[PDB]
Amino acid sequence: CPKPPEIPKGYVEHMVRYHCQTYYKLRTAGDGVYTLDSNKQWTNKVTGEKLPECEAVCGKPKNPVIMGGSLDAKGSFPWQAKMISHHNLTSGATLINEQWLLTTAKNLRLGHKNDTKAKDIAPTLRLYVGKKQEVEIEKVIFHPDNSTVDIGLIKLKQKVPVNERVMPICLPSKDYVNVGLVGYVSGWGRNANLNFTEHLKYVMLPVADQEKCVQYYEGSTVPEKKTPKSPVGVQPILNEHTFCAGLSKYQEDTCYGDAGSAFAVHDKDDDTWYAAGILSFDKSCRTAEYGVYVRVTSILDWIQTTIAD
C-alpha cells in the first residue's frame, strides 16, 4: 500500500478484498471486501467486523492418477497418512480435513489390550502425511459401535498446512458403491514379500456383490447357519455398514497395514476425489477373494457430529 495521490477538494476511503492461498478457499458471509471506519474498524456490511476464513480445498490432487503394484510416482494420494504403533506396525490413515483423519478402530489398538482407553492410546501413536512429515496428534475417538463399525477418528493438535503433498479427501454426498465400480486404494501395508512397502503404492479394485461376499466369509445369510468360512485365519466384520472389493485385473490385493486407507472414487462430474470407503479387513492378502471396507455413508453423520466437539 503506497499512499494513493491526493485530489483537490477530495479525500480517500480505504478498502481491502481478501483472497486465499492456492489450495484454499475464501469462506465468508460476506463479500470479502472490508472497509475502514472513522472508528478505525475494518468492516463489512454483512459480517460486521468478522474477517473471512481460509479453508483447505478437498479431494483435488495436484496430479491425479498392497501385494501388487502401481508405485505412486506423482504423489497422487495427498490424503494418505502412514500410522505406526508403539511396537512398530504400520497402518493406514486418510486425512478427512485440515485437522482430522479417519482410521480403523483395529489399527488404533494395534499396540494394546482391546479395552485400552483412547486417552492412553494416543500418546503412543506416530502419524505421518505427505513426505515424511509427522503430524502431532491431540486426541483419538473410537466409533460407538465396537462390534460392527471398525472406525476411529484422529484429531491433530493443529491444522496441517495443505499443499501438493498433503491435502484432505472429500466425504461423499452420495452413495458411490455399486458393484463393478473401480476405486483406488493407496496403502502403506505389506507387499508380495510380506514386508511393509517402502514406497506408497495403489491398487485399482472393483466393488463386489455383498451377498456373494457374505456367502464367502459366512454360511450364510440366515444368522444361525453362519460359520466362519474365512480362507485366512480370521473373520471380517461384515454388515450393512460395510462393502466388499475383489482383486485387481492383475490379481493384486491389499494386505497387512493397508486398513485405514480410503477406497477412493474419482467422480467424473465433480472432477473430485471422494472417500467411498475405509479399508477394514486387510488380511485378504492374495489368499481371500475380498477385502472389506466400512462405507463412509454410514459414518457420515457421526463424523460431522464428532468434529462438532
Binding site: 501388487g68 503394484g69 502401481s70 508405485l71 508380495a192 514379500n193 512397502t197 492383475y250
Partner: protein, 146 residues
C-alpha cells in the same frame, strides 16, 4: 556388496556353468506367470494370456536375455554396484515406475531357476552367496528412487 573371498569364487565359478541367455528368458517368463501384475509393464510384448503363451513369447525370451546379461555385468564389478546400474535405475524408477518389490521378486525367481538348472551344484552355501548378489542389484536398481 560385501562378499567373501570364497563366496566370490563360488558365484563366479557357478556363473561359468549356466546359460545366462536361457536363464533370463526363463526367469522373466516365470516372474510374469507367478506374479501377474508384472505383466502390466509388458503390454507391448504381445500375448501374455496363459503360461505357455508367456514362456513361448519371443519378446519375453529376448528381453530376459537383456536383463540377465545386465546381471553378468553386475558380477564384473561388485565393489561398485550402484554406479553400474545407476543408468538403469533412472530408467526403472523415473521412466517405468517399477516398485522395488519387483526387483526383489525377479531376483529370487532367478535364484529358483539357477537352482532348477544347476541342481546339486547350487547348494545352500552357494545360494547364500547368490542372495547377497541379487539383493545387491535389487538395491542398486532401487537406488535412484528418492
Amino acid at each position: 556388496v560385501h562378499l567373501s573371498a570364497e563366496e566370490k569364487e563360488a558365484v563366479l565359478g557357478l556363473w561359468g556353468k549356466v546359460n545366462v541367455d536361457e536363464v533370463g528368458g526363463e526367469a522373466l517368463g516365470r516372474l510374469l506367470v507367478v506374479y501377474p501384475w508384472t505383466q502390466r509393464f509388458f503390454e507391448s510384448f504381445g500375448d501374455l494370456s496363459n503360461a505357455d503363451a508367456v514362456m513361448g513369447n519371443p519378446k519375453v525370451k529376448a528381453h530376459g536375455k537383456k536383463v540377465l546379461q545386465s546381471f553378468s555385468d553386475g558380477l564384473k564389478h561388485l565393489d561398485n554396484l550402484k554406479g553400474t546400474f545407476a543408468k538403469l535405475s533412472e530408467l526403472h524408477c523415473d521412466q517405468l515406475h517399477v516398485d522395488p518389490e519387483n526387483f526383489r521378486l525377479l531376483g529370487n525367481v532367478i535364484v529358483v531357476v539357477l537352482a532348477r538348472r544347476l541342481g546339486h551344484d547350487f547348494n545352500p552355501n552357494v545360494q547364500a552367496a547368490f542372495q547377497k548378489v541379487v539383493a545387491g542389484v535389487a538395491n542398486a536398481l532401487a537406488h535412484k528412487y528418492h
